[PDB]
Amino acid sequence: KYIVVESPAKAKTIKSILGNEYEVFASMGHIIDLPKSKFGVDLEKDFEPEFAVIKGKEKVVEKLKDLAKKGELLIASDMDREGEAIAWHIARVTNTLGRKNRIVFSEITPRVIREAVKNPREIDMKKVRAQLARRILDRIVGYSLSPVLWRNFKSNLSAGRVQSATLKLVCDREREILRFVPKKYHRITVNFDGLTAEIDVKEKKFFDAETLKEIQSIDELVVEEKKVSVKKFAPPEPFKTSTLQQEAYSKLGFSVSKTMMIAQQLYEGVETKDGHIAFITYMRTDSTRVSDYAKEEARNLITEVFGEEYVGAHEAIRPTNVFMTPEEAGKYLNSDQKKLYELIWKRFLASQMKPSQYEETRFVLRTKDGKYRFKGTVLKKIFDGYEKVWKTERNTGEFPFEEGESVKPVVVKIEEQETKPKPRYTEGSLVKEMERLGIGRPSTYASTIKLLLNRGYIKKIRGYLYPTIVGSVVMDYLEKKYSDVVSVSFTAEMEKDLDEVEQGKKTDKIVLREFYESFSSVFDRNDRIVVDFPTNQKCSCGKEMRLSFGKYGFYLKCECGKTRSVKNDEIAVIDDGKIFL
Numbered sequence: 001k002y003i004v005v006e007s008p009a010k011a012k013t014i015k016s017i018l019g020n021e022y023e024v025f026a027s028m029g030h031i032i033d034l035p036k037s038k039f040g041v042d043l044e045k046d047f048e049p050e051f052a053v054i055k056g057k058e059k060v061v062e063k064l065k066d067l068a069k070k071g072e073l074l075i076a077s078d079m080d081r082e083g084e085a086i087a088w089h090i091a092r093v094t095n096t097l098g099r100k101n102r103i104v105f106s107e108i109t110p111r112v113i114r115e116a117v118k119n120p121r122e123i124d125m126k127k128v129r130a131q132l133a134r135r136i137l138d139r140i141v142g143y144s145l146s147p148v149l150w151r152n153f154k155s156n157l158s159a160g161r162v163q164s165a166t167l168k169l170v171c172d173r174e175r176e177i178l179r180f181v182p183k184k185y186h187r188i189t190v191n192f193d194g195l196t197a198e199i200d201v202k203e204k205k206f207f208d209a210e211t212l213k214e215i216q217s218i219d220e221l222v223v224e225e226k227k228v229s230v231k232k233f234a235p236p237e238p239f240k241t242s243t244l245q246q247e248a249y250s251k252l253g254f255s256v257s258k259t260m261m262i263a264q265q266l267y268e269g270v271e272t273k274d275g276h277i278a279f280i281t282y283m284r285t286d287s288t289r290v291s292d293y294a295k296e297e298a299r300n301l302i303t304e305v306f307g308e309e310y311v312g313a314h315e316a317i318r319p320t321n322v323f324m325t326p327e328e329a330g331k332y333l334n335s336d337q338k339k340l341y342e343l344i345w346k347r348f349l350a351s352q353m354k355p356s357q358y359e360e361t362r363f364v365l366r367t368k369d370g371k372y373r374f375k376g377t378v379l380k381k382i383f384d385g386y387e388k389v390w391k392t393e394r395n396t397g398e399f400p401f402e403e404g405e406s407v408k409p410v411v412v413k414i415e416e417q418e419t420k421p422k423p424r425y426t427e428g429s430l431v432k433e434m435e436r437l438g439i440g441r442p443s444t445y446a447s448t449i450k451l452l453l454n455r456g457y458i459k460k461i462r463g464y465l466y467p468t469i470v471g472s473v474v475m476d477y478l479e480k481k482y483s484d485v486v487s488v489s490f491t492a493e494m495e496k497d498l499d500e501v502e503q504g505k506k507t508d509k510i511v512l513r514e515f516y517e518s519f520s521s522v523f524d525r526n527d528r529i530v531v532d533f534p535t536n537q538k539c540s541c542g543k544e545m546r547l548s549f550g551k552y553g554f555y556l557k558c559e560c561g562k563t564r565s566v567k568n569d570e571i572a573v574i575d576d577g578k579i580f581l
Contacts, residue, residue, distance in 0.1 A: 002067045003074045003103070003117070004090060006030075006083075010108065013269030013276045014076060017113045022074075025067065031057045032089040034135060039143050041136050047512045049132055051089070061093055068094035074120055076103040079314075080284045080443055081131040081502060088128045097123060106285075106315040108269050108278040111293075130502035133511055137161060137494065140516065144523050145478075152529040153477070154553065155470055155568070159451045165439045165491035166430065166448050167475050170458050171467045173425060174573040178580060180421035187417050188215060190365065190374045192410045194397055197365055197376030204419065212414060218367055220408040221374065223401045225364035231379065232355045235386035237288040238316030239347050241442035242435040244283070247347070249428030252339050253463075256427045256446040262340045263317065272332050278320050279329065279341050284442040287314035290352075297322050298352040306388060310353050318348040350390035357382040361399040365407065424464035438492035456569035469547075469554055470568035472579065473531060481527065485519055533579040547579050 003024045005011050011026040018024065032051050034040040042048040053061050067073045075090050077083035084102075091097040102123050105116040141160035149155055157164060185204035190197050199215070207215065237243070241260075248259040263283035269276040290298075301322050302311045319341070326342035333341055358379040365374045378397040401407060425433065427449050434440030440448065452458045457471030467475070478486045494515065500506040531549035539545055539561035547566070548555050554566040572581050 001072045001074055001117070002070070003076050004064065004067075005076045006078070006086060007268060009265075009268035009271075009276075010076070012271065013108045013278055014113060016269075016276045017108075017110045018117065022117065023067075025063070027057075027060050027064070027090070029057075030054055030086065030089075031061050031064070032093065034139065039139065041139055043516070046509055047136050047516070049136060053093075064090055064094055068096055072099075072101065074101055074103050074117065075123075076105075076116075078284070079104055079106065079282060081127055081134070082443060084124055084127040085131040087123050088125075091123055104313065106291075106313070107281045107320045108267065109320045126504045127502050129508040130498050133501055133508040134498055136512060137515055140519060144519070144525070145482075148525065148527050149474060149477070152527070153470065153474055153531070153549065155455065155457075155474055157474070157478075159444075159448060161486070161491050161494060162439055162444050162448050163451055163457075164475065164478055164486045165437075165488045166434055167452060167457050167467070167471055168479075168486070168488055169430065169433055169437075170425060170452075170465055171472060171475050171573060173422065174467050175575045177421045177424070178573055178575055182418040182420065184416060184418055186212070187415045188374075189413045189415075190218065190221065190410050191413065192221070192407050193400070195376060195378055195399065197363070197374035200364070200373035200375050206416075215372060216412050216414055218372070218412050219410055220368065220406055221365040221410050222368060223363060223403050223405050223407065224366040224373065225362075226399065226401070226403050227362045229360050229362075230382075231358045231360040233358070233385075233387075233392075234355050235312065235350050235353055236347055236390055238290055238318050238351045239344060240285050240288050240316060241283060242286070242431055242440070242445060243288075244317055244344070245431045245445060246428040248340060248343060249426060249431075251343060254336070254340070256431055257450045258336070259340065260446045262337055266337060266341060266344075270332060270337070277324075277332055279324070279333070279337075280320060280344055281315050281318050283317055285314045285317060286442055288316045288351075289314065290316050290318060290348075294318060294322070295352065298349060301349065302353060306353070309383075310385065310388065312352050312354050312386075316348070316351075317344060319345050322349065346389050350386040353386035353389060354383070356385035356387045356392075358394070358396075363399060363401075368406075424466065426463050426465065427460075430465060437488055438495055439488060441495060459569050459571060461571075466571040467573055468569040469566055469572040469579070469581070472572045472574045473533075473549075473554075476574050477529065481524065482522055485522060490518075533574065533577070535578065536580045 001022050003014060003022050005026050006029060008026045011024045015024040031053060033054050034049060034051060040050045073094060073096060075087040077086040087102045100120045100122055103116045103120050105112050138160055142158050146156040149157055184206050186207050188199035245256040245259050248254040260283060266279040267283050269278040299311050326345050329341050330338050358381055360377060360379055362377045378399050379394050381396055430449060431445045434445055453460060456468055458465045459468050484490055497506055497511045501508050501511055531547060533547040535545050535547050537545040537556055539558040541560040543558040543560050545556040545558045548557055553568060556564045556566060570581060572579050
């Protein structure tokens with residue numbers, strides 16, 4: 001039998017497992033694709049795609065056709081929609097579509113691979129159609145709007161729908177920050193015996209001088225209320241793509257593209273001095289489910305290392321072999337791979353362990369004159385559970401006081417503060433928002449963010465993301481002329497529709513016809529657009545400046561002073577028609 005995969009890494013890992021009973025072949029990427037500069041879909045044949053062998057890949061195609069005549073040609077592409085389409089192109093070119101020739105697995109390990117090759121299935125055409133519909137949607141937007149956007153702002157909308165929705169998130173965040181009005185208030189805390197409590201107020205308040213003097217004068221309080229209860233904390237869930245990207249960003253400082261690159265290495269199998277080893281399950285997943293076999297191995301490890309009292313077709317991202325500890329993994333993994341494997345391993349083991357248990361004491365203290373109250377909480381650890389693996393800090397302490405008892409000495413701390421706006425997104429917290437709103441999917445979170453940064457539509461400064469002049473100006477255009485079509489809401493609706501096509505709950509054709517109706521009814525190909533915005537900038541003579549766009553790109557001008565040039569990626573947000581630089 002012959003097995004075909006996309007990558008040399010996967011081919012070597014698979015060949016290591018199967019030996020000489022199977023010949024394993026890598027295609028070295030895609031063989032067939034839509035045209036690179038023809039539109040490629042026939043809008044008069046109900047969105048018929050036009051495929052051709054990619055230049056340079058003709059020989060691979062010939063080899064595949066030859067193999068298919070010599071033996072069963074099994075296809076071991078990754079298990080996502082893209083992989084299913086790869087499988088379909090190979091089956092079509094070899095005239096084997098409909099055979100049981102597609103191998104499905106979430107991990108490249110001996111037990112799993114050996115079973116998977118024995119149980120091939122037919123290519124899932126609903127999954128293929130969901131992929132193709134995505135390609136067609138992107139191609140319609142891309143080939144309609146990128147020329148319009150080149151003519152007017154010298155920039156493009158590839159990865160389009162999802163990319164414009166995500167850009168909108170960043171702009172909306174920036175306007176929220178712009179419009180925020182901070183409020184001064186006092187933070188007032190009392191401190192006694194290692195415990196703290198905050199003043200009890202209906203809203204954040206700026207106290208007057210005489211009230212502050214009084215509060216600062218407090219040196220004794222009385223316990224008004226003491227309530228003790230059991231508090232359990234759930235272990236983390238096993239990673240899925242979205243939460244891996246978020247945590248690798250916040251815990252390791254990895255960009256979401258670096259995380260996915262490393263995760264792919266760990267899944268496909270790394271070459272070692274002695275062979276090849278897969279470390280984790282497939283990295284594009286929306287599931288946090290764990291196989292029964294992996295659950296059992298985890299129970300066995302927990303039992304052995306920690307004790308029984310600690311024990312708690314898409315799959316979570318998790319270690320293929322939980323007994324390969326992060327420390328042992330270090331002899332095979334580079335520094336970045338080791339950090340990522342360690343994260344994944346700790347999250348998985350912790351997810352299989354018992355909740356932790358604490359006793360929580362919530363208390364209220366009052367002054368003797370009854371004028372002021374202060375509220376606090378403290379925890380006491382009963383059982384660490386999963387926190388033995390997933391490191392957690394909590395406000396632990398003791399409340400050695402009863403209701404009605406006086407406490408002295410107390411120390412009051414008064415600090416003037418100002419309310420703060422929402423923080424900007426980071427790559428990780430932008431992924432979180434894309435998941436929240438339904439606009440990203442496992443295969444598109446990282447690529448969307450990367451493209452936005454690469455086109456200079458957003459800019460990263462000390463890890464926070466800012467919209468730029470070109471991002472803002474492009475988004476404003478799309479909002480004005482393609483309001484419904486480019487909305488976060490419509491993007492989310494389309495992504496849900498494509499999930500439904502994959503699941504066989506909607507047809508590709510119905511989804512495509514709906515989109516095209518909405519798009520075509522607003523698409524104006526001959527649109528010419530003079531950039532002309534009021535700004536928050538002033539020139540020497542006192543006048544307001546205006547933003548314009550010429551042969552050397554963006555510039556500011558006033559009906560008096562000289563013209564100041566601006567880079568496409570200078571930070572900027574548009575609000576009520578005015579650009580704020």
